[PDB]
Structure formats: structure tokens, C-alpha cells
Amino acid sequence: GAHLSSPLASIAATNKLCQSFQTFNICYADTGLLGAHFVCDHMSIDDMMFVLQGQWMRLCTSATESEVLRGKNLLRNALVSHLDGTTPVCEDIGRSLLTYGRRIPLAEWESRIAEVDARVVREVCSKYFYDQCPAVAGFGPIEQLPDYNRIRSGMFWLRF
Amino acid sequence: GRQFGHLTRVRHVITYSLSPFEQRAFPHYFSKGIPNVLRRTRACILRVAPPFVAFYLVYTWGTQEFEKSKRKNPA
Amino acid sequence: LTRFLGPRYRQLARNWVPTAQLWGAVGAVGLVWATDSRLILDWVPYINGKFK
Amino acid sequence: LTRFLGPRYRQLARNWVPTAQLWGAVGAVGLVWATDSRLILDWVPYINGKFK
Amino acid sequence: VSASSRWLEGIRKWYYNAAGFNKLGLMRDDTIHENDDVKEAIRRLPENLYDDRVFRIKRALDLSMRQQILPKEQWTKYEEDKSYLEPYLKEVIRERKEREEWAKK
Amino acid sequence: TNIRKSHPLMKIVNNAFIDLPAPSNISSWWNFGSLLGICLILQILTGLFLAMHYTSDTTTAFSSVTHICRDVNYGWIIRYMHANGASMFFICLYMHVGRGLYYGSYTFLETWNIGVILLLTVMATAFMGYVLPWGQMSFWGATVITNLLSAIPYIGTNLVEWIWGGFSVDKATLTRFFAFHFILPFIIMAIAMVHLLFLHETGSNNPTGISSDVDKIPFHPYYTIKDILGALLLILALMLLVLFAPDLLGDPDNYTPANPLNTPPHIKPEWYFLFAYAILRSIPNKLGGVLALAFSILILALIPLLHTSKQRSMMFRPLSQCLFWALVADLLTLTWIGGQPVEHPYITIGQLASVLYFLLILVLMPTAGTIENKLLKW
Amino acid sequence: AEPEHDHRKRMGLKMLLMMGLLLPLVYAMKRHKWSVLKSRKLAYRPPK
Amino acid sequence: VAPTLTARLYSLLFRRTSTFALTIVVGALFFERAFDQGADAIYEHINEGKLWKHIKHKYEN
Numbered sequence: 001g002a003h004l005s006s007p008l009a010s011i012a013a014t015n016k017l018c019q020s021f022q023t024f025n026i027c028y029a030d031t032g033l034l035g036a037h038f039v040c041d042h043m044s045i046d047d048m049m050f051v052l053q054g055q056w057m058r059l060c061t062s063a064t065e066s067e068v069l070r071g072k073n074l075l076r077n078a079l080v081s082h083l084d085g086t087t088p089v090c091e092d093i094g095r096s097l098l099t100y101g102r103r104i105p106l107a108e109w110e111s112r113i114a115e116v117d118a119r120v121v122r123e124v125c126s127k128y129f130y131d132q133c134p135a136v137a138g139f140g141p142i143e144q145l146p147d148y149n150r151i152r153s154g155m156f157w158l159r160f
Numbered sequence: 161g162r163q164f165g166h167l168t169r170v171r172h173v174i175t176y177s178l179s180p181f182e183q184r185a186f187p188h189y190f191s192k193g194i195p196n197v198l199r200r201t202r203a204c205i206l207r208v209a210p211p212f213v214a215f216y217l218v219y220t221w222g223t224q225e226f227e228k229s230k231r232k233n234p235a
Numbered sequence: 236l237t238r239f240l241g242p243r244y245r246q247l248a249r250n251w252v253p254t255a256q257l258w259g260a261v262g263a264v265g266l267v268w269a270t271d272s273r274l275i276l277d278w279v280p281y282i283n284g285k286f287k
Numbered sequence: 288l289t290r291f292l293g294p295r296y297r298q299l300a301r302n303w304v305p306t307a308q309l310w311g312a313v314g315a316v317g318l319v320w321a322t323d324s325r326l327i328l329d330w331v332p333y334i335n336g337k338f339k
Numbered sequence: 340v341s342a343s344s345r346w347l348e349g350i351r352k353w354y355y356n357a358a359g360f361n362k363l364g365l366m367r368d369d370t371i372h373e374n375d376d377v378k379e380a381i382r383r384l385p386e387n388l389y390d391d392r393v394f395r396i397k398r399a400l401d402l403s404m405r406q407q408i409l410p411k412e413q414w415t416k417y418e419e420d421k422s423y424l425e426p427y428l429k430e431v432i433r434e435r436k437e438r439e440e441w442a443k444k
Numbered sequence: 445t446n447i448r449k450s451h452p453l454m455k456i457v458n459n460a461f462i463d464l465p466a467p468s469n470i471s472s473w474w475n476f477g478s479l480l481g482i483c484l485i486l487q488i489l490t491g492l493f494l495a496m497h498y499t500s501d502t503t504t505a506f507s508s509v510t511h512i513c514r515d516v517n518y519g520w521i522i523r524y525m526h527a528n529g530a531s532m533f534f535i536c537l538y539m540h541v542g543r544g545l546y547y548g549s550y551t552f553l554e555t556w557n558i559g560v561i562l563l564l565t566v567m568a569t570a571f572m573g574y575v576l577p578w579g580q581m582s583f584w585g586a587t588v589i590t591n592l593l594s595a596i597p598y599i600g601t602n603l604v605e606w607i608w609g610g611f612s613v614d615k616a617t618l619t620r621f622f623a624f625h626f627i628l629p630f631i632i633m634a635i636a637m638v639h640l641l642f643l644h645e646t647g648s649n650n651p652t653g654i655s656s657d658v659d660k661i662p663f664h665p666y667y668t669i670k671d672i673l674g675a676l677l678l679i680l681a682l683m684l685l686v687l688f689a690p691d692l693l694g695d696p697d698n699y700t701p702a703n704p705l706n707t708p709p710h711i712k713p714e715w716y717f718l719f720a721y722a723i724l725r726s727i728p729n730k731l732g733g734v735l736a737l738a739f740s741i742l743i744l745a746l747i748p749l750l751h752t753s754k755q756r757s758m759m760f761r762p763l764s765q766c767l768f769w770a771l772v773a774d775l776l777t778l779t780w781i782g783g784q785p786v787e788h789p790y791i792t793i794g795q796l797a798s799v800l801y802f803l804l805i806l807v808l809m810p811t812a813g814t815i816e817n818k819l820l821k822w
Numbered sequence: 823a824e825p826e827h828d829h830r831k832r833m834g835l836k837m838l839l840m841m842g843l844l845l846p847l848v849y850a851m852k853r854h855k856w857s858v859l860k861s862r863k864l865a866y867r868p869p870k
Numbered sequence: 871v872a873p874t875l876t877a878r879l880y881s882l883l884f885r886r887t888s889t890f891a892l893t894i895v896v897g898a899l900f901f902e903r904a905f906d907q908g909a910d911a912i913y914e915h916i917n918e919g920k921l922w923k924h925i926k927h928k929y930e931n
């Protein structure tokens with residue numbers, strides 16, 4: 001509920017701003033899709049866009065040491081919890097050999113995770129998120145879904 | 161006052177849009193533009209012009225008749 | 236008062252410091268240009284043209 | 288226009304006629320008193336006191 | 340049926356073409372002013388007609404904005420201008436007129 | 445949360461200028477609403493800087509205006525900006541009203557009716573504003589128009605002498621006209637606010653007269669940037685006048701001080717009153733003059749009750765389109781006749797255009813709408 | 823009668839030269855933002 | 871010229887709204903000098919000799 005670490009998650013629960021959201025980093029050869037998906041009431045699309053976009057921007061300009069350690073910790077946990085039993089590991093062997101050419105050992109993933117301070121997050125986020133044109137897909141009761149120009153406008157901060 | 165999300169019921173309509181940074185502002189400015197203005201002039205000249213042409217005649221005659229009224233050839 | 240004193244806030248200040256510096260430059264050059272403040276404008280090469 | 292023409296409306300008019308008459312009296316005496324309209328006020332006994 | 344009644348029909352086809360809503364793909368009933376009887380008739384339409392109506396209005400507002408018109412073949416033909424609102428609107432006015440006859444006695 | 449929505453002040457700004465659902469398809473003819481607001485602000489800002497130097501007495505009324513243009517630092521720029529801004533305001537009022545008539549926007553009963561009150565108030569302002577320089581046209585325009593109120597039965601002469609502060613347009617008339625000219629634009633702005641309150645209730649109409657609910661776009665950034673471009677065009681037209689032709693739309697007699705004993709050869713308004721000035725001289729009766737003169741503007745309040753068409757807009761209405769342009773051309777005829785003397789061809793065609801104006805609104809356009817319905821089997 | 827004459831012709835040139843730079847530029851700004859709507863494509867997909 | 875003049879202008883000065891405002895402000899100062907004088911110079915050519923600035927040397931002391 002209200003006590004959740006993530007600002008978007010906490011505001012979304014408190015103000016009943018959605019039924020769900022999820023971040024993603026879909027990977028392809030030399031390209032991919034990076035952002036969020038959410039499902040919400042017809043009247044809640046605008047606030048949801050605002051609160052999410054503002055989060056991308058907060059992180060792009062003003063990410064902090066503590067929250068970045070949490071993100072590192074969630075990832076360490078995500079990576080270890082995922083590689084549990086023969087089916088996930090065999091999948092990781094097959095996929096990694098096609099996409100990386102080798103199997104990247106868990107110690108190396110940790111090494112590459114441990115490297116990521118706040119300065120890294122806001123630089124890397126800026127490279128991809130800051131002042132970029134999004135791909136937007138909308139379905140359902142979408143009268144309140146922001147106009148593209150306004151979404152595009154939420155991709156930068158006038159304050160920064 | 162009404163806001164978005166409370167306006168009306170719309171079903172089964174897909175809108176495809178492009179970012180302004182991916183597309184040009186003046187796509188075919190003169191090539192598509194010039195034919196279009198001529199087309200909508202043609203579509204309206206029969207409704208807009210015939211009152212003005214009528215005023216022009218009532219103006220041109222009126223001004224002419226005003227000048228040639230004070231002067232007189234016999235005493 | 237005491238609530239805003241911590242490691243995160245020092246980071247948050249450090250993060251917004253180049254930005255708050257650059258807005259000061261915007262404000263200054265903005266004020267200098269708008270008033271035609273001669274004291275500062277006597278130093279700049281092309282704008283110098285106001286020979287008494 | 289044609290919708291307001293019927294027995295009920297004739298009754299409704301008859302019902303509000305003494306009222307609409309009395310508001311006319313309020314308006315008239317109101318206007319007469321506020322302007323000091325001499326033409327009408329020359330007729331009333333105590334208000335008559337304005338000897339030229 | 341008649342030579343001059345074919346002429347009233349040809350003058351009507353002329354006006355229809357001059358009105359030019361068909362150039363924007365609209366049907367006649369799309370173009371009606373929305374009063375209380377009209378609002379109710381739209382409300383009373385089945386799903387398929389309402390959805391088509393919405394799209395035709397959507398399309399014409401889009402064309403209006405970009406100051407375009409449809410290709411000639413895609414114009415609503417006078418002969419096939421389906422008067423979909425007619426029986427609905429006639430029924431709403433029928434109902435209103437009754438209420439008004441009742442409000443009279 | 446977005447503070448644009450929650451904050452009591454910003455809430456209004458968001459609902460009025462930012463997040464307001466606006467039709468996708470509104471013409472350049474919808475621009476004049478914002479342009480009128482620019483013109484009202486422009487008039488307040490130029491008018492005030494003039495009031496910082498203007499004297500309200502018959503003695504140096506003319507001299508203060510001279511002092512502004514001659515001695516006051518860039519005073520000439522402000523003075524012609526105000527005088528041309530008043531005309532700019534009037535070109536806009538007319539496009540705006542015409543747009544309202546063509547597109548059926550008058551069916552917004554309250555919005556439109558508040559706009560009729562708005563037109564009368566801007567007219568009353570400009571009339572009083574013109575007296576202020578105390579030129580020949582300033583005085584003689586004032587005497588020729590106020591004297592009409594004499595024609596009202598019984599009340600008549602008492603009214604004129606109450607508006608006059610004496611027995612003619614004198615010392616007192618110049619002073620009170622300044623007071624009323626100072627207060628009116630603020631009362632205009634407050635009515636313009638109530639105007640917009642009533643508009644936001646329904647939102648804007650559009651060139652088709654069909655509802656735009658299915659295709660609404662946010663006011664920002666579409667109508668923000670379109671109103672910026674439109675204002676840049678209004679500044680172009682205003683600054684073309686102020687900086688190349690400052691005396692074009694004005695009368696030369698205003699450049700000589702007022703003289704109650706000497707009447708000028710011609711007595712003509714600025715272009716924006718010429719149509720109505722023509723209607724007045726067209727009818728020989730005194731009272732019939734003023735009653736046709738009031739009916740010249742007050743008629744717009746009847747226009748909604750004279751709507752006969754099954755459709756809102758004239759977009760799909762060719763019979764009505766011709767009779768509309770006839771009204772614009774007829775008003776241009778009345779404009780021409782207003783600035784002309786009362787001799788032979790002009791008396792007849794003047795009153796011919798005058799009877800046409802009223803026939804076109806009261807009888808002709810309500811008939812075309814009925815026929816257009818019959819043609820669609822409606 | 824018109825002492826300002828020379829000055830108004832001067833700023834008038836500056837007015838025209840500025841508007842000649844600003845008019846196409848504000849037009850291009852409006853045209854940029856509006857291209858989202860001008861190139862938008864509609865498709866109507868009603869059920870079976 | 872290897873990345874475009876516009877590409878290097880976005881990277882250095884248009885990314886941050888701070889440097890965007892700064893480039894507008896610094897660009898407004900330098901534009902005012904080049905324009906005011908440049909338009910005055912054009913005004914000199916269409917009114918050659920007619921102006922007091924050309925006459926000046928006639929009445930000296």
C-alpha cells in the first residue's frame with residue numbers, strides 16, 4: 001500500500017490510480033523497448049502517465065545513492081530467484097549462448113550490478129529516457145489518454 | 161464544463177499518429193497546397209463573390225451618378 | 236528544518252547544483268541585457284559599441 | 288407556441304391574473320414615487336404639497 | 340411517377356450535391372443539429388448504427404481540420420443516403436406531442 | 445499529484461487554457477475570441493499610459509494629446525497604438541460576430557447574449573473615447589449623436605440634458621466621458637470573464653455544426669500555438685497601421701481644436717460606426733432614426749429565435765451562404781454610404797441597403813433555412 | 823505636424839524585417855505541433 | 871560537420887532547458903547588436919545624405 005518504497009507504486013496505491021503497472025526492458029539484437037505498461041480506470045490515465053513520466057525524469061536528473069542500492073538489491077534477488085531449478089537455468093544457457101555468445105556467470109552479473117551508483121543511473125537513464133520520442137500503445141477506454149505532444153512534453157523537464 | 165474521460169462513448173476506432181520529430185512540418189507545401197486552395201476557391205466563388213460583384217456595380221454606378229448630377233448643359 | 240538534514244539531501248543538492256548555477260547565469264545575463272547595465276556590458280567585445 | 292394553448296393554461300393565467308395586476312400597481316406607484324412624477328402626484332391629497 | 344416530379348427529384352439531387360456533406364462522407368442525418376428530441380433519437384439508436392455514426396462524424400471532423408474532402412467515388416450518393424434517424428426522431432416527437440396534449444387539459 | 449488540477453487558482457487556468465477539450469477542426473475564424481482579449485488588454489495598457497499624461501478639461505484636452513505625441517518619450521507610439529487598437533478591436537468584433545452567425549454559434553443562448561451586451565459596451569466605450577482629444581470631429585460627432593435622445597417621447601429632452609451636464613456637449617461632458625471611458629473596459633473584462641464561463645459549459649462549436657465530442661483535442665498545445673501565431677498576425681496588422689499609415693483610418697478635422705460655432709463640411713465616424721450612421725440618416729423621422737439605430741445591433745438578440753434550419757452551420761447550406769454574403773456586402777454598402785454626403789444617388793441606395801439589412805435578417809435568411817429543409821425532405 | 827516621421831519609418835523597417843523572420847518561424851512551430859494531427863490515420867474496425 | 875551542426879547544437883546547448891535558456895539569452899544580446907545597427911545601416915542607404923548624421927560636418931562649432 002502507502003508504505004511501498006517506489007514513489008509510483010506508493011502514489012498509485014494511495015490514490016487508487018491503477019489496478020497494476022510493470023516496468024520492462026524488452027531486448028532484441030541491437031534494439032529494444034524500454035518503459036512501462038499499466039491498466040487503470042478511464043478517469044485515471046492522465047495521472048498515471050504524469051506520475052510515471054515524472055519518475056523517469058526524477059531518475060534522469062536527480063537519482064539518489066540509497067534508492068539505487070535498493071534497485072541493485074532487487075536485481076541481485078531477481079537474478080538469483082529466477083535461476084532456481086533445471087528449467088530456468090537450461091533456458092538461461094540456451095538464450096545466453098544465442099544473445100551473448102557465452103554464459104555470463106552470476107559473479108560477473110554481480111560485478112556489473114555492484115558498479116552502478118546514482119551517477120550511473122542518471123547518466124544511463126538520460127541516454128535513453130531524457131528528451132526522447134516514446135512509442136505509445138493504447139487500448140480500451142482511452143479518451144483520457146494524453147495527446148502525443150503532451151506525452152512528448154513529459155519526456156523533458158523545464159526545471160533541468 | 162466537461163473533461164476528457166467524460167465526453168462521449170466511442171467504440172472500435174484506431175488512431176495512428178507520428179512524433180513531430182519523426183515527420184516534416186511542410187510535407188508537400190506547394191505541390192499538395194496550391195491544388196487545394198484552388199479547389200476550395202472553386203467550391204465557394206459562386207456563394208462569396210456575386211454579392212460583392214453586385215456591391216461593386218452599385219458602388220461604381222453610384223459614384224458616377226453622384227458626379228454627373230450637379231453639372232448642367234442648359235441654363 | 237531538522238528533517239531535511241541527511242545523506243540523501245546532500246546528494247539531492249549536489250544533483251541540482253549545476254542546474255541552479257546555470258539558472259543564475261540565465262537570470263544575470265537576462266538582467267544585464269534587459270537594463271543595458273553598462274558596468275558589466277563595457278567588458279563584452281561586440282556589444283561594446285556605445286562610444287560616449 | 289401551440290403547446291401552451293389549452294384549458295389548463297387558461298386556468299393558470301386566471302390564477303395568476305390578480306397577482307400580475309398587483310405587481311403592476313407595485314411597479315407604477317414605485318415608479319411614480321421614485322421620479323416624483325408630478326402629473327400623477329397632483330391628484331393625491333397629502334402628497335399634494337409642492338405649491339409653485 | 341411524373342416528368343416534373345422527376346425534376347423536383349433532380350433539383351433535390353442538385354441541392355444535396357451543393358450542400359456537399361457527402362464530400363466529407365457524411366449522411367444527411369449525421370449533419371442534424373442536436374436538440375433534445377435529436378439527443379434522445381441518437382440515444383435510442385442500436386449499437387451498429389451509433390458506432391457507424393460516430394465514425395462518420397469522426398472522419399468528417401478529421402477532413403474538416405485538414406481542409407480536405409474525400410475522393411469522388413467515396414462521396415455519399417443521394418440515392419443511397421440512408422435516413423437512419425427518421426423513425427427514431429419521428430417517435431420521440433410523437434411522444435413529446437402526446438405529453439404536450441396531456442399537459443393541456 | 446498534478447498541481448494544475450488540485451490548486452484552486454491553477455485549476456481555473458488548466459480548465460480554461462490547458463486541459464480544455466477543444467474541437468480538432470476549428471477555423472482561423474475561432475482565433476478572434478483570443479484576439480479580442482489581446483485587444484482589450486492592449487487597450488488597457490496603452491490607455492493607461494495615455495491617462496498618465498492626458499488632461500480631462502476643455503482648455504488643454506487637445507494640448508495634452510499634443511504633449512503626448514510631441515514631448516512624451518515614445519508617446520506618439522502609444523497614442524497611435526491606442527487609436528489603431530480600437531479599430532483592430534472592431535475588425536475583430538465583426539469577424540467574431542459574423543463567424544457566430546455563419547456557423548450557428550448563436551444557439552449558445554447565454555454566451556451569445558452576453559456577447560451582444562459585450563458589443564454594445566465596446567461601442568459605448570469607443571464613442572466616448574473619441575470625444576477625449578476634443579477635436580472638431582470629437583465634439584461634432586458627440587453633438588450629432590447625443591441630440592438623438594431628444595426624440596424619445598416625454599422623457600427625451602430631460603435625458604439629453606442629464607447626459608450633457610448642461611444644454612450642450614460642454615466642459616462637463618468631456619470630463620464625465622473620460623470617467624466612463626476609464627471604468628467601462630474593466631466592466632467589459634468582467635463581462636468577458638462571464639462570457640467565457642458560459643462558453644466552457646458547452647465548449648466550442650466547429651465549422652460543421654456537428655458535435656466534436658468524438659474528436660476533442662486539448663487546448664494546449666494546439667490552440668496555444670495557434671493563438672500565438674494569430675496574435676503575431678494581429679500585431680502585424682496593428683503595427684502596419686501605427687508605423688506606416690497612422691492617419692489612414694482617422695478623420696483630419698480631429699487635428700483642429702473643437703469649435704461649437706463652426707460645423708465641419710462632413711460629419712463622419714471612423715469606419716466601424718459608418719454602417720449604423722448610414723441607417724440613421726436613411727430614415728427621415730427623428731424617433732424612427734434612433735429606434736432603427738438601436739434595432740441595428742439589438743437585432744442580434746433575435747437571430748437565435750429566427751433559426752429555422754435543421755442543421756446548425758451554413759457549411760452545408762448554399763441558399764443561406766448566398767444570403768449571408770449578401771449581408772456582408774450590404775453592410776459594406778452601408779459602410780460606403782456612411783462616409784458619403786446625403787445627396788441624390790446616396791439617399792436612395794442608402795435607405796435601400798438599410799431596408800435590405802433588416803429584411804435579410806428578419807425575413808430572408810429564416811425563409812432560406814426553411815426551403816433548404818424541404819430540399820433535404822426534413 | 824509629424825516630428826516622429828523619421829523614427830516611425832525606421833522602426834517600421836525593423837517591424838517588417840522582424841515579422842519577416844518571426845512569421846514563418848512561429849508558423850513552423852505551429853505546423854510542427856500540428857503535424858501529429860495532420861498526418862494521423864483513422865481505421866474503423868467494428869465487430870464481425 | 872561529421873555529426874550535423876544541429877546535432878552538436880542539441881548535444882551541447884539544447885538538451886538542458888538551463889543551457890537552452892542561456893543560449894536564448896546570450897543569443898538575444900548578440901542579435902540585438904547585429905540587428906539594431908544592421909537595420910540602421912540599411913536605413914542609411916535609402917536616406918543617403920537626407921539625415922542629420924550625414925549633414926553634421928556642415929555646421930561645426
Ligand code: HEM
Nearest residue numbers: 474477478480481544549550556559560562563636648649
Ligand atoms: C468583448 C469582445 C469579446 C470577447 C473578448 C470575446 C471572447 C470570446 C472568446 C475567447 C471566445 C472563444 C474562442 C472563440 O470561439 O472565438 C468566444 C466565443 C464566442 N463568442 Fe465572444 N467575445 C467577444 C465578443 C462577442 C460578441 C460581440 C458576440 C455576439 C454578439 C460573441 C458571442 C460569442 C459566441 C456565440 C461564441 C461561441 C463561438 C463558438 O465557439 O462557436 N462574443 N468569445
Ligand code: HEM
Nearest residue numbers: 487488491492494495498527530569570573574576626629
Ligand atoms: C474597451 C477598450 C478601449 C477602447 C475601445 C478605447 C477606445 C478609444 C478611442 C477610440 C480613443 C480615441 C482615439 C484617438 O483619437 O486617438 C481613445 C482615446 C483615449 N482612451 Fe481609450 N479605449 C479603451 C481603453 C481605455 C482605457 C482602459 C483607458 C483608461 C486607462 C483609456 C483612456 C483613453 C484616453 C486618455 C484617451 C485620450 C488620448 C488619446 O486620444 O489618445 N482607454 N480610446
Ligand SMILES: CO/C=C(/C(=O)OC)c1ccccc1Oc1cc(Oc2ccccc2C#N)ncn1
Nearest residue numbers: 570571574575585586589712713714717720721737
Ligand atoms: C463622439 O463621436 C464619436 C464618433 C465615433 O467614435 O465614430 C467612430 C462619431 C464621429 C462622427 C459622427 C458620429 C459619431 O458617433 C457615432 C455613434 C454611433 O453609435 C452607434 C453605433 C452602432 C449602433 C448604434 C449606435 C447608436 N446610437 N453611430 C454612428 N456614429
